[PDB]
Amino acid sequence: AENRPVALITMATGYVGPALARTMADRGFDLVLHGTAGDGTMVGVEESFDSQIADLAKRGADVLTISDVDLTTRTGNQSMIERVLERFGRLDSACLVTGLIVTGKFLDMTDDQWAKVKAGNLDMVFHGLQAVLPPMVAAGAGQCVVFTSATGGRPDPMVSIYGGTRAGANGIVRAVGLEHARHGVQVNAIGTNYMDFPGFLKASRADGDPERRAMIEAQVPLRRLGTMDELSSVTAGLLDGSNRFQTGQFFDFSGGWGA
Amino acid sequence: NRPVALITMATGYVGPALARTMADRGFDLVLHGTAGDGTMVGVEESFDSQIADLAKRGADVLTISDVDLTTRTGNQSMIERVLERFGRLDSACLVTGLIVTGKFLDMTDDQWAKVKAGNLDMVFHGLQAVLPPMVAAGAGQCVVFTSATGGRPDPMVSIYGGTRAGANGIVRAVGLEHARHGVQVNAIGTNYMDFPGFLKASRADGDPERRAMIEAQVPLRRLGTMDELSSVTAGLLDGSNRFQTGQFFDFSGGWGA
Amino acid sequence: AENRPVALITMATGYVGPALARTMADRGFDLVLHGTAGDGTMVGVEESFDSQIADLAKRGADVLTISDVDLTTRTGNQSMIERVLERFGRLDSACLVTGLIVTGKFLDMTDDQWAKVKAGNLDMVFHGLQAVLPPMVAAGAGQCVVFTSATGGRPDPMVSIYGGTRAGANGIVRAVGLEHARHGVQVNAIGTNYMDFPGFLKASRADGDPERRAMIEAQVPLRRLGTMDELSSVTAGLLDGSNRFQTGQFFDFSGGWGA
Amino acid sequence: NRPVALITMATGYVGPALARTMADRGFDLVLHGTAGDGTMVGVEESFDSQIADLAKRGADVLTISDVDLTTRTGNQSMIERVLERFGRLDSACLVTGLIVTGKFLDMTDDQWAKVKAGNLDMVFHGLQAVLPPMVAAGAGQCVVFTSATGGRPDPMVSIYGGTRAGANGIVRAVGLEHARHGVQVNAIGTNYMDFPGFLKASRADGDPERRAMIEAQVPLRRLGTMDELSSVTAGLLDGSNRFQTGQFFDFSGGWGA
Ligand SMILES: [Cl-]
Ligand SMILES: [Cl-]
Ligand SMILES: [Cl-]
Ligand SMILES: [Cl-]
């Protein structure tokens, strides 16, 4: 009877997940966090589920955690949404964080690297959207954000297959966001670059290297790395019901780099 | 002290709702717009009606109503009055444009002059006036309202949509050019918005059948509300997001996707 | 000796292939035609190799045909280019026709449909470019056109996974064209729609139906279907050495539909 | 009877090479340009230097000078002279623009007026003049030269690049709007072309060192040639391709990709 909306956030033990969960809880949502199990020492885990759950529960959110599902597959994504609906009976918002980073010269790319970028950058999008949309269509309302990459808006040398498949994800999102708009469902993509979190600081090798860090920031028009507080704010605005008038769109979030 | 937001054409369109939420977010306000009560032609919410409410929200308000924003003089004078009153300018929402439609080969020199003045001169002179105090302060946020037509200039909208695309291009360059000074400049272009101006021009006002026909042109099958638009606009003007600049955002229910 | 340049054209028994081969021969090229074996009464064969070879040889062009090789894989594309180089010792231009059409509601798409579109719209591009570029890089000059689809410039409802993956192919071409510009190797994409050839008439269901065809033509700003003579002229202009100053670009060729 | 192609600014830029290949392709020619010999400012191939070669290729040639193509009067006069001479206008190559660069906040009202006249008025009035005879005939092909900067309006090029984006938008709408009449209108935008206007704007003229620095900005690492550009341009004007309209083509060595 409380009629609390439910937001799914994937890869939620890092990147935008933790800050987005906090603000979605502040906005009255119950939460489903997909991510990697383990404590803060686990690789890729920036904020563990145990730490997040305690804070999110303090905010009044009910939280379901989902770990060790392979979201590059139909099975993983279908299982995830079945568990969402079992717990909460509804899905109002979904933040699908996708991707697998591969960089290098185009002619150096192997079949394995090609397979991996397709699995991360496209299969996660295809199967994720096939899983989250049915309950949204059934309800006549929903909001989805797919995280792709700012490289999808300008695929450049050394990120040919990563950036190119990100552009494909953006295109799928355009079609899908337009196709389900008549059912009250928004699907948009956000693509970031130059964000201050471990994943970026490693791919750019700015980690523990102030001189590298500074050269990287100088590549950004706004001369800084973006923060997860800023990104969670924009992302929540596309998932909290406050804006029901954009769909099928791609939003660059990279300090002007993808303008 | 409280940061200061300038909003133009603020007696209609997004202005009133944006003023309300910016006041909620802790800003003082400078409202440029049209003098008079709600019975005047352009006035959707009078200055008089807004001042009472915005003061209750904690905002000091300065109104400016006698300036032509197609010229250097009008915009320079507006910003001079902002700084005289509050000593700062943190955010600016510049609403621009003059609508002309019709066959390209029917457009007169006067129609061409007018769309350039509304769609381009207001942007050029507006940004030249608001940016200097922001650059001097090392921080600022600007949203220029152009049009969703700028993202897809179409038949029967050639000179309007085309000059809107030009305004978006100016915003791209200017937003990238002043990024190193901590200043953001972005553009928003709408269509199919639920406000009296569009309702009356489309004949959806008071006409449910016509409104349904108009909504059917929109992927999301509705008209956007000013509360929604003001939320998105304020998110680019309230300090919460300092990581987008030089960008154009379509806000038309998917119509410009 | 004669220093005749060599152009590869794939899927050349239909679509733009036959007209492009004629005009490239006229412009002084030797030709490698990949395609489907069989006479004109074969499915998908608009002009058989036998009929094309007679005419192309009359124009002075040497022709190598490459039949029944699968271009969705590394092995097929690598074998194709090995045979090009064994026969002619060079590859100056390549027209890579790619794709596999699937349409329908996004939520009706099966894993098999998804695999199929990825293989046609992305794997053919990845493996095709990995095969054709090395000899062009070695020579310090080359020109490539990848045929994707006008839907890649505007992925729409009912065309989500096809148009979206086409957008990804366009993005790969952008990055690859920019990345090999230092080697003098242009890589551009052309995306068509509403072309007067069987493949479109079937997907649109306008064949033998003047009313449906008239409805389809009315969706085109220029109010007609495009011809292979027009398309081959534009394509040859990106492959004949006359224009070496565009790369990484996508060109819509759909009567204004993708403008 | 030969079809007729109008080419403006034809004493420099793409004009001379385009005239040569359009003559080869069977066209008679109207060449608008600057009167005088090659020592005149901007004259790369004088009218006098071109005429013998063009006649040998089979073309009748009318030359036109001293019309202000930023105005309705000049463009209307030009097309009237085309029709009086040849009775038809099949193809038009409208070269437009006036380069201004510098910091946005340094731009004067005079600089703003000049870029609007060059980058927008030339397009508006040029298209209003060439299209009526093409629509009446049920066929025509037009290329408007804007700038590659219109695809990516950048710092230091704000009002030039921005208004070029507007010209591209006008061309999109107009190309779509007259497609039902069998008329194509497309834009080509160049940068990094090997001709005096670009060399001077980039300050690389007559200076191998600075030219190398400029070429380093281009993915294909050189300046484009007029033979290449005229090939692409003629392909949109020679009747061979009647299936693109309302489009913008970057021609800048990948710089605008
Ligand atoms: Cl990032
Ligand atoms: Cl609106
Ligand atoms: Cl087609
Ligand atoms: Cl140039």
Author numbering:
A (entry chain B), C (entry chain A): 4 to 262
B (entry chain D), D (entry chain C): 6 to 262
Publication passage describing the model:
Interestingly, whereas T123W yielded wild type-like crystals only, we obtained six different crystal forms for the T123G variant, which may already indicate an impact on the dynamic behavior of the protein. After solving and inspecting all of these crystal forms, two (T123G_1 and T123G_2) were chosen for final refinement and analysis, since they encompassed all structural changes with respect to the structure of the wild-type protein. Superimposition revealed that mutations T123G and T123W have no effect on the overall fold of the protein or on the position and orientation of the catalytic residues S152, Y165 and R169. A more thorough analysis of the variants shows that mutation of T123 to glycine or tryptophan leaves backbone hydrogen bonds to G102 and K119 unaltered, whereas side chain-specific contacts to L103, K119 and N124 are abolished. In variant T123G, on the other hand, the additional space generated by the missing side chain is partially occupied by L103, resulting in a slight displacement of a loop connecting strand β4 and helix α4 (residues 101 to 107) that covers the catalytic triad. This intricate movement could impact on substrate positioning in the active site and may hence explain the increased catalytic activity of T123G. On the other hand, the T123G variant shows the closed active site conformation already in the average structure obtained from MD simulation. At the same time, its loop mobility is significantly lower compared to variant T123W. Variant T123G was the most active one with a 5-fold higher initial reaction velocity in the azidolysis of cyclohexene oxide compared to wild-type HheG.
Halohydrin dehalogenases (HHDHs; also, haloalcohol dehalogenases or epoxidases, halohydrin hydrogen-halide-lyases) are biotechnologically relevant enzymes for the production of chiral epoxides and β-substituted alcohols. In their natural function, they catalyze the reversible dehalogenation of vicinal haloalcohols with formation of the corresponding epoxides. HHDHs possess a catalytic triad composed of serine, tyrosine and arginine. Protein engineering of halohydrin dehalogenase HheG for thermostabilization revealed several residues with positive impact on the apparent melting temperature.
